[PDB]
Amino acid sequence: MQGHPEVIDYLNTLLTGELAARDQYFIHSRMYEDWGFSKLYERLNHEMEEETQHADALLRRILLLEGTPRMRPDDIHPGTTVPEMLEADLKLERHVRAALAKGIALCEQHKDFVSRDILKAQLADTEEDHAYWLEQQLGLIARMGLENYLQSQI
């Protein structure tokens, strides 16, 4: 079944964004482990796997719709300290959140309700899991101080 070209193009834009999110969590998780923060390594390694699944869902939907997937990831922007890396990931998730919400609206307009639902599942993950967790870590640093926070992530 041929998808609507505007939907296919927009899924491709989301795909390159998810491939980038995967890779930014790849580098951040391994940096966290290089510094000895294994709890941060574990969480971001887990988020890398989740973005890989998000990318996979979009890639397969594009193929089903007879489109050609775009595999070049967007540029990533890693931080250099724990607070910068948390902020840089939160900035990325907020961008993903906005892009997914715009996609859902586009899918509704072109009556592609299955692509809409695929994006909705990713939007819930983005808001309620990925972005929320980052906001909580930054909140914790604010409440107990960075040194105590870092101690808790060994």
> Taking CB under 5 A as the rule, does residue 130 contact Fe ion?
yes
Which of a copy of itself, Fe ion, Na ion, none is residue 130 near (CB under 5 to 8 Å by kind)?
A: Fe ion
The verdict on 22 binding Fe ion (CB under 5 A) reads no
Residue type, 11: L
Number of residues binding to Na ion, judged by CB under 5 A: 1
Radius of gyration of the chain (CA): 17
The residue within the footprint of a copy of itself, chosen from 14, 21, 26, 54 (CB under 8 A), is 26
Q: Phi-psi category of 137—alpha, beta or left, where left has phi over 0 and alpha has psi -120 to 50?
A: alpha
Structure tokens belonging to residue 116: 């809409």
For 148, which DSSP code?
Answer: H
Alpha-carbon distance 44 to 24, whole Å?
9
Q: Which stretch binds Na ion (CB under 5 A): 23-31, 73-81, 124-132, 141-149?
A: 141-149
Q: What is the DSSP string of 89-117?
A: HHHHHHHHHHHHHHHHHHHHHTT-HHHHH
Residue 85 one-letter amino acid: M
User: Number of residues in contact with a copy of itself, rule: CB under 8 A?
Assistant: 57
In the range 38-67, which residues lie near Fe ion by CB under 5 A?
A: 51, 54
Closest approach of a copy of itself to the CB of residue 64, in Å: 6
Q: Under a CB-based contact definition with an 8 Å cutoff, are residues 12 and 129 in contact?
A: no
Mark the binding-site residues for Fe(3+), compressed into ranges: 18, 46-47, 50-51, 54, 93, 129-130
Contact 73, 16 (CB under 8 A): yes
Residue ranges binding a copy of itself (CB under 8 A): 1, 19, 23-24, 26-27, 30-31, 33-36, 55-56, 59-60, 63-64, 69, 71-73, 75-76, 78, 82, 94, 97, 101, 104-105, 111, 113-114, 117, 120, 123-124, 127-128, 131-132, 135-137, 139-140, 143-145, 147-152, 154
